[PDB]
Design a protein around this ligand. Structure first.
Ligand SMILES: CC#C[C@H]1CN(S(=O)(=O)c2ccc(N)nc2)CCN1c1ccc(S(=O)(=O)NC)cc1
Ligand SMILES: O=P(O)(O)OC[C@@H](O)[C@@H](O)[C@H](O)[C@@H](O)CO
Length: 585
């Protein structure tokens, strides 16, 4: 029947009460799951929100229970990290015609960029040629833009890969996809397996391979799952690798920019740093050198979240400014500036928020005076401006900008990273009365830009900004339990996530949910057979431009009414949130 090809794979909605016993819950990929810690996140206050995400983030470092999924600390995973470190060594010994690509869509792609830079720096400070590069769904521009639609083509991924891999002789391709989902990566990994003389694919993500994505990709014949299963078979002969620890669900269901991006750095920085810092010692990478690093990353979580009360406060202020109608500026230096940009941009697609709502700034790349003359003018009594820097940064450039911002603003707060016993110039740096001083112990570092200190700091900022950005929006009522219902459908994964949210919150069949969804998307056109049979990309292209697609679709269902009737209802309610929530009641 029309549509059967496209929707056959979708699991039926269970009868009320049998969500567990239908086996439905057990087949939800971990990366899409509702985290039980966050069932009532939409009710939590700022302090709880910080607590509940701190807990969710902790799950990264939690160990394997005694019938269950491998985790970051499990022996199978650390052994895989060692073996991969090893293959990175091979290429490090033979830099001529060698290359190491880190690749991903969206936040996986963003993380890839950071790491390729860091490790390229590292080989510079040692006077070696840079061997790292990145690849992001939609080219370089995607690093710092909301561009969710660019991940759906396997040919694109392969193309980008062919460009960069030039006339190289030995290529390591680290395909990053948190959900083991992005068609962009899938095609890269498959291409690698079809030329193993040159390519070595390493897939990174955080689902078991039995939960890897399995619906058809429009421009490619195999699924992510088939690709990953075959890489796993090659791992026996050491010609492919799959590195996939479970880290437990996101605190915002399927918001893989959070734990997933974090785990990506923890996992890949750890392994690459080990491989470098152990080549020049002429010693194999071992579980012991990896562990040192992982434990440091784990202290970093503890260090970071011990500043929780302040983190809650900055959340309450970021939220306040967005409840009124102000903006939120994230101003930071080096690498920590970028991360700030990355957070701001992600808020657009993640919460449907305008790019001014939470914006990032590096010193998007607007210099000291340029910021003072351009942006400073537009500031306002209700806004919030966050400063993010180390005490190694150039604090004369910092104080200047805060001096000025204080006048036109007042809601400032800051994120200051330091070694123990560095002191904050100006004891009347108050200015910031109640800073977020994150003060780092003294580690022993032989590489020359203290790369472990950088990684700690990046990660810690990512945790803070993410928790803030996400928390501020939850407080506003935009989140339904631990799901973002009212998302914009801009790729296929999001289209499937909409359909899952329709099933979950309505309890109605998949045929009904699909029908309501496609009607909401294509309104005012009716459901023809063509539309029913259309590739998922046709729906995406149309829904991408509309507003409230998913809430309209859900209303149609709850009221058993038409799209015309549910649009009218929505427009007659005070808000999307009250409309949906009170139809649920
Ligand atoms: C319909 C459907 C579905 C699946 C898979 N889709 S998928 O096909 O894009 C996908 C993504 C990643 C992956 N590893 N496998 C499939 C994502 C959303 N999915 C999903 C399924 C269930 C839920 S939920 O159970 O309502 N939240 C607990 C949330 C999301
Ligand atoms: O790394 P994945 O699972 O292939 O997901 C890649 C991207 O879709 C994902 O990072 C997304 O852009 C983020 O907005 C999710 O919060």
């Amino acid at each position: 029947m029309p549509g059967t090809k496209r929707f056959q794979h979708v699991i039926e909605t269970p009868e009320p009460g049998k969500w567990e016993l239908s086996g439905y819950e057990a087949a939800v990929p971990i990366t899409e799951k509702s985290n039980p810690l966050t069932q009532d996140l939409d009710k939590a206050d700022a302090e709880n929100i910080v607590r509940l995400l701190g807990q969710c983030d902790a799950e990264i470092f939690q160990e394997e229970g005694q019938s269950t999924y491998q985790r970051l600390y499990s022996e199978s995973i650390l052994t895989t990290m060692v073996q991969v470190a090893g293959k990175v060594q091979e290429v490090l010994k033979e830099p001529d015609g060698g290359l190491v690509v880190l690749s991903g869509g969206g936040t996986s792609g963003r993380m890839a960029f950071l790491m390729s830079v860091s490790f390229n720096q590292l080989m510079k400070g040692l006077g070696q040629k840079p061997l790292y590069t990145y690849l992001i769904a939609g080219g370089d521009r995607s690093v710092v833009a909301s561009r969710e639609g660019t991940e759906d083509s396997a040919l694109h991924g392969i193309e980008e890969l062919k460009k960069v891999a030039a006339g190289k002789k030995r290529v390591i391709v680290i395909g990053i996809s948190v959900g083991l989902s992005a068609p962009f990566v899938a095609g890269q990994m498959d291409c690698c397996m079809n030329n193993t003389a040159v390519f070595l694919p390493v897939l990174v993500g955080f689902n078991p391979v039995s939960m890897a994505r399995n619906d058809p990709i429009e421009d490619w014949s195999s699924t992510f799952r088939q690709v990953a299963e075959r890489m796993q078979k090659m791992q026996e002969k050491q010609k492919a690798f799959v590195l996939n620890p479970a880290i437990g669900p996101e605190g915002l269901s399927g918001s893989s920019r959070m734990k997933g991006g974090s785990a990506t750095k923890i996992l890949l920085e750890t392994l690459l740093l080990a491989a470098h810092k152990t080549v020049d010692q002429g010693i194999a990478a071992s579980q012991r050198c990896l562990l040192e690093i992982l434990r440091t990353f784990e202290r970093a979580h503890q260090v970071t979240y011990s500043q929780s009360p302040k983190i809650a406060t900055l959340m309450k202020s970021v939220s306040t400014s967005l409840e009124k109608k102000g903006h939120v500026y994230l101003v930071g230096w080096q690498t920590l500036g970028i991360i700030a940009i990355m957070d701001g941009v992600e808020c657009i697609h993640t919460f449907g928020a305008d790019f001014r709502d939470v914006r990032g700034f590096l010193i998007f790349t607007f210099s000291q005076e340029d910021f003072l003359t351009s942006i400073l003018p537009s500031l306002t009594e209700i806004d919030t401006v966050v400063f993010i820097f180390t005490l190694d940064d150039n604090l004369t450039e910092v104080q200047t900008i805060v001096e000025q911002v204080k006048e036109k603003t007042n809601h400032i707060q800051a994120l200051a990273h330091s070694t123990v016993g560095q002191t904050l110039p100006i004891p009347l740096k108050k200015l910031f009365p109640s800073i977020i001083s994150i003060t780092w112990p003294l580690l022993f570092f032989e590489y020359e830009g203290n790369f472990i200190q950088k990684f700690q700091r990046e990660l810690s900022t990512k945790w803070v900004l993410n928790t803030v950005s996400t928390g501020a929006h939850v407080l506003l009522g935009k989140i339904l339990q631990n799901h973002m219902l009212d998302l914009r459908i801009s790729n296929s994964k999001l289209f499937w996530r909409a359909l899952a949210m329709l099933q979950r919150f309505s309890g109605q069949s998949k045929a009904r949910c699909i029908e309501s969804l496609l009607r909401a998307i294509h309104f005012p056109q009716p459901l023809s057979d063509d539309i029913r049979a259309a590739p998922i990309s046709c729906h995406v292209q149309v829904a991408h431009e509309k507003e409230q697609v998913i809430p309209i679709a859900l209303l149609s269902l709850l009221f058993r009414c038409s799209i015309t009737e549910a649009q009218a209802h929505l427009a007659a309610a005070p808000s999307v949130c009250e409309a949906v929530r009170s139809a649920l009641a």
